[PDB]
Amino acid sequence: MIDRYKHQQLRIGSVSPQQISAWATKILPNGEIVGEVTKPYTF
Amino acid sequence: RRELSEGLRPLHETFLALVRLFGAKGLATRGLEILAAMEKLKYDIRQAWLVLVEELVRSNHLEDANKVFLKGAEGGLRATDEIYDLLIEQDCKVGDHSNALTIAYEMEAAGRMATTFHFNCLLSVQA
Amino acid sequence: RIPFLEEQVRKIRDGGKLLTMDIHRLLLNEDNRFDFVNEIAAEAKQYVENNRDEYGAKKAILHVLSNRMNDAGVYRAEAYMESDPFKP
Amino acid sequence: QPHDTPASQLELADPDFYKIGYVRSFRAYGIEFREGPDGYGVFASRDVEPLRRARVIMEIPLELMLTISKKLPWMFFPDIIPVGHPIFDIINSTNPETDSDLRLACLLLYAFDCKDNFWQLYGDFLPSDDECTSFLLATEEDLLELQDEKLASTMREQQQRALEFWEKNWHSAVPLKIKRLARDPERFIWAMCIAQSRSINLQMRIGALVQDANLLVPYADMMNHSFQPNCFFHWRFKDRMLEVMINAGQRIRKGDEMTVDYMAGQKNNFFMQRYGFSSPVNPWDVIHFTGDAKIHLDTFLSVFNISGLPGEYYHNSRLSNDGDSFVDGAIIAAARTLPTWSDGDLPPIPSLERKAVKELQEECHQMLAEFPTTSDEDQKILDSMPDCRRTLEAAIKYRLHRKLLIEKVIQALDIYQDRILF
């Protein structure tokens, strides 16, 4: 009797200063890079 | 077509020879129509299907052979142990694991359980 | 042959205790009680995918169980539905 | 008017036969047991339409049957032999591979001498020494009348072995516990005959132990034999009950004869050796040909509509039904035993097959004349004796079936030689 052989591997690790940019940096219509917070007051 | 035009159903040996010739030439798509013609004539398409898959395997046509085997297995047609072994051996020697695992599942569902040989082939592709 | 025994028989047939016996009888031929549940769920899904409204009398699971009990020689109602004829 | 059914010719059995089992946990659904001259049989009393799954017709509990394991540690799951009884020394002093009927016979003899046991009440329905068809209870005259030297030699050797076992185990210095079991040497022979003609080998599971054992089950030995069966035995481990279930898809009408398969895939000689039964439509009986003539196999299967793999030959009715009523088990056995040749898809030559069919026919004629008698003479002898011994009846039926198989092979060869040229 062969099993179904389900394989799931949850991996953890410390992020790199290059991979951190892949989360917040998004594209825009004009092309300006956005994703940085530069103002202290939010509202 | 000449024999069929006069309103006479052909024999089983003629259809078997036609299926063997179409399988030796690699023309897999032209064998399913012959199998359907045998089915509409109230024949049995088990031995013809086995001859088709065996001749497709022996003629260096593996993908179409596995396709024909999977198409015939879903319809309730079981196969011999020798074909079950040959398909797995060839698919593992080529490097195809998906079709080998599907054939192994169909084999275990039909009634024959896997032996060491089968698992060994699968492990070869896995390692 | 006890004479005064029809009342509890009618109570069993009406309250719905037949299903509790049928489930236990069907669990006498299967090794695992989980593969049986999976098979019944798959059969009910296949029967409800064909005809949505015509899943049976009321539901599909009861219909599947009634079909499985009627193929073994035990007459059962359609999806275990028997209305009360004495309701004004 | 009464409906003409194969079950209507027989009369209903004694209601005590079912009453002695219904008091236990025995049930029989949609079945009616009917006794005739040959013996009891199980028939149907309700039209069973083609079902998607099997339907149970018998539920026989474990505490109603005997059981002896096939391996070396002899475990009797229905514990009826107390520890210390000297019958276990007789059961244990046997070869664990060649003689398994001796242990079943000893267990049956002991069960016949134990109170509150079901077999003390069921033994009244078992065949006696005059209505049994086994060849152990036969004479030298009937064995010589069989016209088969090897089968007669085997039966004589088996009778000798039974007598020697009884003489070696039931001597004079034996305690009375064993002596009262089989006082006469015929009782042990009858016990062996019952244990050999009614045993069923089935892999049973109780608790966590899965083993194969030889069990004598009541109410299931009444099932007749048929090479196209309708039912099969199934073991239910949740309740420790054996089931007889109809096959899935087969249509059973009222009055049909419920049958199972005894020794599926065996020659017609072992049937006569064990059960004392012979059938002319056996699809596995072998006919030995010494000639070198070889007929064509694929054309022979195509002309008789025998479609299927060499392991499973069936007649395809939807190809030809009325046209081919000749197609029975005999032609299948012929196609399995005929010397055949096949070289790819090369078409056969009519001259070669026409020259081979006559050689096969003359070989069949020279092998048929070896018997001292003929077919019509045995056919008249079988019904010339209205009430004769069962062994002589079985022997004359065996000879008649052999001759009828030879004649059927000859007629099939004639049909093949005259129908190959359409």
Listing DSSP states for D86-142 in one string gives THHHHHHSS-TTT--HHHHHHHHHHHTTSTT-THHHHTTSS--SSS---STT--HHH
Closest CA to D119 of D196, D200, D21: D21
Distance CA D57, CA D207 (A): 25
Structure-block tokens of residue D218: 């009541």
Structure-block tokens of residue B16: 């078997």
Crossing angle, helix B46-58 and helix B81-94, to 10 degrees?
30
Q: Are B104 and B79 in contact (CB under 8 A)?
A: no
Contact state of B104 with A1 under an 8 Å Cβ cutoff: no
Distance CA C7, CA B67 (A): 62
Q: How far is A15 from chain B (nearest CA, A)?
A: 31
Structure-block tokens of residue D185: 């040497």
- Tally of residues, chain A: 43
Q: What is the separation of C-alpha D365 from the centre of its chain, rounded to a whole number of angstroms? A: 30
Contact state of B46 with D345 under an 8 Å Cβ cutoff: no
- Gyration radius of chain A over CA positions: 20
Quick check: helix, strand or coil at residue C84?
coil
Burial of D183 (0-12, 13-18, 19+ CB in 10 A): exposed
Phi-psi region of D185 (alpha: psi -120 to 50; beta: other; left: phi over 0): alpha
Distance CA D333, CA D265 (A): 11
Residue A42 makes CB contacts below 8 A (sequence gap 6+) with: none
Distance CA D172, CA D87 (A): 15
Q: DSSP secondary structure string, D167-220?
A: HHHS-TTS-HHHHTT--SHHHHHHHHHHHHHS-EEEEEEETTEEEEEEEE-TTT
Distance CA B87, CA C48 (A): 37
The nearest alpha carbon in chain D to C73 belongs to D55
Residue D24 makes CB contacts below 8 A (sequence gap 6+) with: D61, D63, D64, D118
- Which residues, in sequence order, are bridge partners of residue D48? D252
Distance CA D279, CA D229 (A): 14
Dihedral angle sign, alpha carbons of residues D123, D126, D128, D129: negative
Distance CA B36, CA B27 (A): 15
Contacts of D307 in chain B (CB under 8 A): 12, 43-44
Q: Are D211 and D75 in contact (CB under 8 A)?
A: yes
Q: How far is C71 from chain D (nearest CA, A)?
A: 6
Question: How wide is the angle at C-alpha C64 spanned by C-alphas C62 and C69, nearest 5°?
Answer: 90
Residue D397 makes CB contacts below 8 A (sequence gap 6+) with: D278, D382
Closest CA to D205 of D237, D179, D159, D162: D237
Question: How wide is the angle at C-alpha D415 spanned by C-alphas D412 and D421, nearest 5°?
Answer: 140
Elucidated via: cryo-EM
Q: Give the amino acid at A31.
A: G
Most D CBs within 10 A among B3, B8, B42, hence the mutation to make, goes to B42
Distance CA B78, CA D35 (A): 41
Other chains touching A, judged by 3 or more CB pairs under 8 Å: B
User: Chains D vs A: touching, with 3+ CB pairs under 8 Å?
Assistant: no
Quick check: helix, strand or coil at residue D306?
strand
User: Chains B vs D: touching, with 3+ CB pairs under 8 Å?
Assistant: yes
Q: Are D281 and D227 in contact (CB under 8 A)?
A: yes
Closest CA to B88 of B74, B109, B105: B105
Contacts of A1 in chain B (CB under 8 A): 108, 113-114
Structure-block tokens of residue D234: 């199934």
The nearest alpha carbon in chain B to A3 belongs to B105
Q: Are D29 and D182 in contact (CB under 8 A)?
A: no
Q: How far is B103 from chain A (nearest CA, A)?
A: 12
Contact state of B105 with A2 under an 8 Å Cβ cutoff: yes
